[PDB]
């Protein structure tokens, strides 16, 4: 009826489907559009020189082999059929450890469309490494990014672009950090060149201005207070020596 | 030939079954009935603004493709039949690093009822985010959330529901409390529709209301601070003919106040605002400094 | 070629679930080690790290071929297709093999059926340190291993004459200790499932008081 | 036992204007409050579920607005057939209804 | 889609009644079934709750011990048994079906129970 | 010979074996007996409110499908056959992170006996969680237990007991904790009730 | 339909292919050309005697079984084709615990040239061991090695070689430096043979030369030691009639030296010899103690 029809459609789509080959393998490059919904930026560590972020990372491309016309609706399939389709080998150049969430199942999304378009989303928590310039700590502003690149396919096999180019990354203004504050963010398209070829790259950068109230009450207030305390040594008369020594040395040791 | 009839039932059950298609893909809406049995409310980490919870997560729905007829009315099957049928792809919207336990086998439960109703239960430890506002630290009350829903199935495909009355769905065990610093007062469930870049999804929200216990911060910081203030006020009864005495009084009470403030600010995260322990320490420091300047004046 | 024919003929009618001589005699396994480094011996968790090249060799009469080549030298691809003993370290808290860039395992089959199987391991073994006389103490704490499921009547272990070989001993992570020697031992232990042949390697360490001196004394 | 206080008990108004009914709970009922309409000598019909979710088959002039405790039902540009009794009922716990609200012309 | 209840009747004070509610268009093993009581020109009052798949029931504390709700999946019906009647039991009894975010979307036709 | 007989016996045992069904799927429950050989108790953490223990965890039950009579010896099989047999879905209720050791292979044991008795052993490193009452710290005594339950199978499908009932847990008197000392240990058998049914628990 | 032809090509390449055999097992020696692109030289953990390094690790060899003739001259295939064919089993001789990234897909690269050449690239994070001689700490220089070779393949079977000129084979990126405490000066490659218990193996060595930056240790230890010594020496200018003043000067200066030595010793790992910072702290402590004993004599 309406279920076995879709069953036959999906079985026909996946019959004679080579996962080793990208769409238009010997033809023009395939365009892949990116979306990121940032869920949280967890911990920006200065000692590890990294920052953790959770995101809903979605990719959209067009595969002419996954094109159907028997049924008129869009197909959201179980997330385990993404192991039987071709998905791009996207990676993050500056990460240290990353994973797709696997609760309650592998947090990934596959979605087909009748014209051939495939949408493929993941929920990724990644610890990306960004080297900070702490010459003005804690009155500093550090811009560190996430680079999104293709590993195997060069720029003549695949194309990366932000899907929307200004609304591709959402949820940045709703992010609340305990120590920083996102002032601005930028999206960049690029092509990098290695010894194996030229590869497309996207880059998502966040400028974080560090807050000061924590540092005020933790270090600037105690140091100013100890320096104020070390001035009552003059109000004491110069005859009593032991008192002034104890006071001044206690401020120096503090 | 005692298990051959059940093997035939299970083989016929999966013969012609596509585990990539939800029940009623273009015909109906999948109704999932959810239930949570909290076996232990884990420790609440204050520096990461997160908490841990360990739950039996139960989901029930109806698949007309899994109807059978045999000598049993409910098949209590293994945790490997669940990977050969369609199960909903529930994720936790505010989870950080959750684990679905598989010791010694995958802690999953599958029960199929003869009319096609499935009960699917998992045992998993969720580490979720709890954004806290620490104005009243350490006399603050929080509502730590736990939001879940379906990944990739919008409201027109999969909708969630509590299987019992919403006030009796999320059930916390009695011995299940691994809280050292907080106090679990009650639970609070909720339902809504969030909208993201792929459509509108149903989200089931749970709130656990926590109230911090002050009995540790009292003895840690509030009692040394009041003792230091009283010991600073001791100096007002001494005779002015002993100047080094009151001098070492002032400088050492300011020194202990500095150490206590540094030693007290390592408890809570590196928040940018002032708390109520910070206000208490600041006023106590002001009192100590006022005693020292009063000594300087006299 | 012909090596493909040999490898495909060895695996026909082969059952990797059964040890050689499953109802005839126990299998004799000769074990060798090569210690790359003995890691930090931290006394907090009562453990120490070690990195070894663990090599086992035994006889499997099913992997016997007739050809003009004497030895087949293979990858880790065929390790999971033949019978491999279930050796495990009894005093390890954590232990992992190495998988970068390809699983660090080696299999070599000979003309008469002798199989040699080597793999690289990094073990975080435990040894209870009686911390009296600290830091002027000397220890000798072990690395033990045996089969998990096969008792003495099914798998028998035996050292070779050149059993345990250390490397340079200078590139090792022994900060507070100093390696002085080792000794091998074999024994049989009573377990709820049966008698198991257990092999132990005791590394003898002496704590060098060069850190505790300028640290505390 | 969560009690629902509905207001007002009765309200008389003409055709075409905007009208609003209020319902309050003693305890917490998080967007699980439904609004039913019962005509004389008939059975109650579900109008609004959740707190703001129009039932499949109702006009667009009914609107629900919800919270944790305070809920409201707004009917803009009423007709001659929207006169009936209106009950608010919670479902966060075992269901309890409100006293009702008569609507007269 | 439709819930059909029994017919109105009179009953003598002190007897017992059994009201019926026949469901058509769905299977009662999927949803919960509620029984609601309405007095003339008053608000609705919830009597009790039955889970037809398992069989466990809950009742309003005011109606605890007075009403007994049961089900029959063969004839696809749900029953409400009232015992030890009084004069304040003259009401209209409704049989409702749970669905769409705990809303009681489908109701019966209501039976008039009068006590003389 | 002996290799051919054992080979065809094991191949006959695994031919037509339904891993979805427990032994006596419609009949009486299957009885599983537990042994624990405690190798160590690693770190009893008061800040994390947990402890870590390594154990040799063994389960014994009787499956009539794995019955043979042509050879008089017990069959220890390579541990990879444990993925082709039914083993109970035992779990620990109060654990936080567990794993089976994997050097040099997955540390587990599967043994078949001629009467159908299957012996299944694992080597586990469990970080179990126990809340401590530190009101008398450091002059305190704390009892925290490892709970052993069956997840999927209810008490009318499976049954747990200790193999020996007093000697099922060994190696506990040999534990050398640096900060504590084991005073006593107990083995308990009961049944717990959850909203899905009744489950056996050790 | 230009996808069926490449499927037929890839299926003809793998028809009768045995990935348990190296290319040229009976005729020649497998020669693998190696390349390393360091995308970031990670932090050097001196406390663990190890360092981290993120690399593109490239290998290239010739397999006469993967010759083809199609419209394309190079097949830039997936990372799941490299598991069905033979690839060298390179391992790091001094690697401790390395990872191979799997995000989002396995970060591997396989290219097959028309004449049979294979290019195989991986992206992985090596955590290798760097034995350090901390006799001149913190004014020391190191040469952290990275030895890799073939596991299971002797010198008569698989040999390694650099794909370009040895001075130009290991390439470190410009912004590829996650070092906070050291300064990368250059690279240094070598190749040799190790004699093991199973045969001779080709080993390719790479040394990264590091020089420790003194800017941290100056402000941490050398500025407090000099300032504390000056604080001890300023006591000699006070008159001899105020003995408690100079006494508490000396003893609190000793206190400062002790807490300084404790805070400065906890940075460096627990080596069993004396470094340069240890000698500096010892001589400064000797000067401070000599000042206090000299005052006691006075
Ligand atoms: C609870 O659930 C847990 C999670 O699901 C689960 O943990 C999992 O355990 C299982 C089983 O123990 C693991 O699966 C095995 O993993 C072995 C290696 O384990 C190490 O590496 C993995 C990551 O594995 C990748 O890399 C290895 C080596 O390169 C591959 O072999 C894997 O396939 C996999 O490859 C991909 O991913 C790479 C990036 O990671 C990519 O670069 C690559 O391109 C691939 O895409 C780590 O995760 C492990 O860490 C964890 O586990 C260790 C255990 O020691 C812990 O100590 C540690 O703390 C971590 O927790 C670990 O480091 C694999 O070797 C193994 O693959 C073979 O065996 C299986 C099972 O028999 C076969 O089905 C499979 O076919 C493989 O066999 C082939 O190859 C072997 C080689 O030895 C041959 O012997 C064999 O004959 C066969 O040969 C044939 O096929 C070849 C191609 O495959 C071909 O080339 C040959 O020619 C021939 O035809 C297996 O995958 C799994 O990784 C764990 N998962 C995680 C995340 O931990 C846990 O067990 C569950 N617990 C319980 C109680 O239920
Ligand atoms: C944080 O730092 C990063 C990296 O330094 C910044 O990214 C860079 O932004 C600039 C300005 O938008 C880019 O310059 C552009 O060059 C192109 C050349 O065609 C020109 O057409 C554009 O108009 C613009 O001038 C630059 O390419 C880009 N990437 C770099 C510099 O690596 C980022 O903007 C910084 N701040 C924030 C808020 O992210
Ligand atoms: C490892 O074990 C072997 C075998 O037991 C030891 O070799 C023996 O050494 C003794 C002398 O101490 C000889 O009398 C035996 O005949 C040797 N046996 C054989 C056949 O090797 C070897 O010394 C041990 N190495 C240690 C203890 O590290
Ligand atoms: C499929 O998705 C597209 C884009 O999201 C949308 O425009 C279209 O209406 C969808 N198809 C159906 C049948 O709703
Ligand atoms: C098999 O095991 C049982 C129980 O351990 C034992 O009694 C019996 O003797 C064993 N048989 C053989 C052949 O070892
Ligand atoms: C790496 O990813 C591939 C495909 O996503 C998967 O098949 C493989 O199991 C993964 N490896 C690990 C260790 O997770």
């Amino acid at each position: 009826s309406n279920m076995s029809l879709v069953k036959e459609t999906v079985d026909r789509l996946l019959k004679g489907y080579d996962i080793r080959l990208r769409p238009d393998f010997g033809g023009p490059p395939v365009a892949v559009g990116m979306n990121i919904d940032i869920a949280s930026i967890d911990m920006v560590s200065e000692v590890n020189m990294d920052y953790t972020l959770t995101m809903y990372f979605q990719q959209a491309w067009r595969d002419k082999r996954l094109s159907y016309n028997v049924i008129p609706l869009n197909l959201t399939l179980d997330n385990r059929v993404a192991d039987q389709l071709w998905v791009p080998d996207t990676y993050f150049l500056n990460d240290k450890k990353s994973f797709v969430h696997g609760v309650t199942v592998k947090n990934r999304m596959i979605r087909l469309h009748p014209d051939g378009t495939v949408l493929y989303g993941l929920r990724i928590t990644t610890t990306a490494a960004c080297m900070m310039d702490l010459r003005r700590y804690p009155l500093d502003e550090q811009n560190c990014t996430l680079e999104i690149e293709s590993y195997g396919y060069t720029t003549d096999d695949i194309e990366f672009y932000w899907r929307g180019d200004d609304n591709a990354v959402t949820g940045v203004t709703k992010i609340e950090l305990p120590q920083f504050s996102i002032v601005d963010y930028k999206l960049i398209t690029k092509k990098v060149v290695f010894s194996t070829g030229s590869y497309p790259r996207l880059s998502l950068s966040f400028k974080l201005k560090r807050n000061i109230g924590y540092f005020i009450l933790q270090t600037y207030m105690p140091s100013i207070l100890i320096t104020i305390l070390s001035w009552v040594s003059f109000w004491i008369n110069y005859d009593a020596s032991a008192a002034r020594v104890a006071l001044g040395i206690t401020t120096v040791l503090t | 030939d005692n298990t051959t009839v059940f093997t035939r039932i299970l083989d016929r059950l999966l013969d012609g079954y596509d585990n990539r298609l939800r029940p009623g893909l273009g015909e109906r809406v999948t109704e999932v009935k959810t239930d949570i049995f909290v076996t232990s409310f884990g420790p609440v980490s204050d520096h990461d603004m997160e908490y841990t919870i360990d739950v039996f997560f139960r989901q029930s729905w109806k698949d007309e493709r899994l109807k059978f007829k045999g000598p049993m009315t409910v098949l209590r099957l293994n945790n490997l039949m669940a990977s050969k049928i369609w199960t909903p792809d529930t994720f936790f919207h505010n989870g950080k690093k959750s684990v679905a336990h598989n010791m010694t086998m995958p802690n999953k439960l599958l029960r199929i009822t003869e009319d096609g109703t499935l009960l699917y239960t998992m045992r998993l430890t969720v580490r979720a985010e709890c954004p806290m506002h620490l104005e009243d630290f350490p006399m603050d009350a929080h509502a730590c959330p736990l939001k879940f829903g379906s990944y990739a199935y919008t409201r027109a495909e999969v909708v969630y529901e509590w299987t019992r009355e919403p006030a009796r769905s999320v059930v916390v065990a009695e011995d299940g409390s691994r809280l050292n610093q907080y106090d679990l007062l009650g639970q609070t469930v909720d339902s809504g529709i969030v909208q993201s870049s792929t459509g509108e999804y149903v989200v089931m929200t749970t709130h656990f209301h926590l109230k911090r216990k002050i009995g540790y911060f009292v003895i840690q910081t509030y009692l040394p601070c009041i003792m230091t203030v009283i010991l600073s006020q001791v100096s007002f009864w001494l005779n002015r003919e002993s100047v080094p005495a009151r001098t070492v009084f002032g400088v050492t009470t300011v020194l202990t106040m500095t150490t206590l403030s540094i030693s007290a600010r390592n408890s809570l995260p590196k928040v940018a605002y002032a708390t109520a322990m910070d206000w208490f320490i600041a006023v106590c420091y002001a009192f100590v400094f006022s005693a020292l300047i009063e000594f300087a004046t006299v | 070629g012909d090596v493909t024919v040999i490898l495909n003929n060895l695996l026909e009618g082969y059952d990797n679930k059964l040890r050689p001589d499953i109802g005839v005699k126990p299998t004799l396994i000769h074990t060798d080690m090569y210690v790359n480094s003995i890691g930090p011996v931290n006394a907090i968790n009562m453990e120490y790290t070690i990195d070894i090249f663990f090599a086992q060799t035994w006889y499997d009469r099913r992997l016997k071929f007739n050809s003009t080549i004497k030895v087949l030298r293979l990858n880790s691809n065929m390790v999971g297709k033949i019978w491999i003993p279930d050796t495990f370290f009894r005093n390890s808290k954590k232990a992992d093999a190495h998988w970068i860039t390809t699983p660090n395992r080696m299999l070599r089959i000979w003309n008469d059926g002798r199989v040699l199987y080597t793999l690289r391991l990094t073990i975080d073994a435990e040894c209870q340190l009686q911390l009296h006389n600290f830091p002027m103490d000397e220890h000798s704490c072990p690395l033990e291993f045996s089969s998990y499921g096969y008792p003495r009547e099914e798998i028998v272990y035996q050292w070779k004459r050149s059993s345990v070989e250390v490397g340079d001993t200078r590139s090792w992570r022994l900060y507070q200790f100093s390696f002085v020697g080792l000794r091998n031992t074999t024994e049989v232990v009573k377990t709820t499932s049966g008698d198991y042949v257990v092999m132990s390697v005791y590394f003898d360490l002496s704590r060098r008081m060069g850190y505790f001196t300028i640290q505390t004394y | 036992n969560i009690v629902m206080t509905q207001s007002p008990k009765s309200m008389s108004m003409s055709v075409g204007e905007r009208v609003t009914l209020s319902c309050k709970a003693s305890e917490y009922v998080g967007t699980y409050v439904s609004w039913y309409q019962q005509k004389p000598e008939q059975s109650p019909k579900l109008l609004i579920y959740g707190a703001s979710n129009r039932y499949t088959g109702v006009p667009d002039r009914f609107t629900g607005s919800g919270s944790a405790t305070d809920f409201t039902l707004t009917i803009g540009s009423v007709q001659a057939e929207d006169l009936a009794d209106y009950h608010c009922g919670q479902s966060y716990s075992y269901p309890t209804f409100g006293a009702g609200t008569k609507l007269e012309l | 889609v439709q819930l059909q209840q029994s017919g109105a009747e009179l009953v003598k004070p002190g007897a017992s009644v059994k009201l019926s509610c026949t469901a058509s268009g769905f299977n009662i093993k999927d949803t919960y079934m509620y029984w609601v009581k309405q007095r003339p020109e008053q608000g609705l009052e919830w009597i009790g709750r039955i889970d037809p798949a398992n069989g466990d029931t809950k009742y309003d504390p005011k109606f605890q011990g007075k009403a007994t709700i049961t089900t029959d999946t063969f004839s696809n019906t749900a029953y409400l048994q009232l015992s030890s009647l009084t004069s304040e039991d003259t009401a209209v009894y409704y049989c409702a079906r749970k669905g769409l975010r705990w809303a009681m979307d489908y109701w019966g036709q209501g039976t008039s129970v009068t006590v003389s």
Side-chain angles (χ1 to χ4, degrees), chain C residues 159-161 163 182-184:
Chain C
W159 290 115
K160 285 186 172 285
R161 293 182 183 174
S163 58
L182 55 90
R183 62 187 186 279
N184 60 36

Side-chain angles (χ1 to χ4, degrees), chain C residues 3-4 7-8 11 37 51 53 73-75 77-78 96-98 100-102 104-106 108 116 118-120 122 165 171 173 175-176 208 210-211 214-215:
Chain C
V3 190
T4 306
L7 288 177
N8 283 10
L11 288 185
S37 87
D51 196 347
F53 285 117
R73 319 160 167 263
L74 313 158
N75 297 29
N77 281 323
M78 209 185 166
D96 211 27
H98 292 246
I100 300 308
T101 70
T102 297
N104 299 162
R105 296 172 177 192
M106 177 199 80
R108 283 179 190 168
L116 165 78
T118 302
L119 75 162
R120 183 187 190 199
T122 292
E165 304 159 349
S171 88
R173 280 203 52 195
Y175 316 118
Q176 310 149 29
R208 34 172 61 171
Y211 161 70
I214 66 184
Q215 181 79 330

Side-chain angles (χ1 to χ4, degrees), chain D residues 28-90:
Chain D
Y28 167 93
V29 289
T31 173
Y32 278 110
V33 171
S34 58
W35 288 93
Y36 316 85
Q37 163 187 49
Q38 180 181 22
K39 294 189 174 179
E41 309 98 21
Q42 268 195 16
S43 45
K45 315 193 202 63
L46 180 73
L47 286 187
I48 293 287
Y49 73 89
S52 45
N53 278 130
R54 277 180 280 267
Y55 193 51
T56 79
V58 79
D60 210 287
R61 54 180 185 271
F62 298 98
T63 307
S65 159
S67 314
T69 190
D70 209 323
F71 306 84
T72 81
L73 176 74
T74 52
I75 311 154
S77 88
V78 309
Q79 269 73 19
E81 72 157 40
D82 290 354
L83 294 90
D85 280 17
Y86 289 82
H87 315 264
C88 57
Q90 60 95 22

Side-chain angles (χ1 to χ4, degrees), chain B residues 102-106, chain C residues 76-81 95-97 99 101 103 105:
Chain B
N102 62 329
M103 193 79 219
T104 75
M105 295 269 289
Chain C
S76 49
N77 281 323
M78 209 185 166
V79 164
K81 297 192 182 314
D96 211 27
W99 310 93
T101 70
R105 296 172 177 192

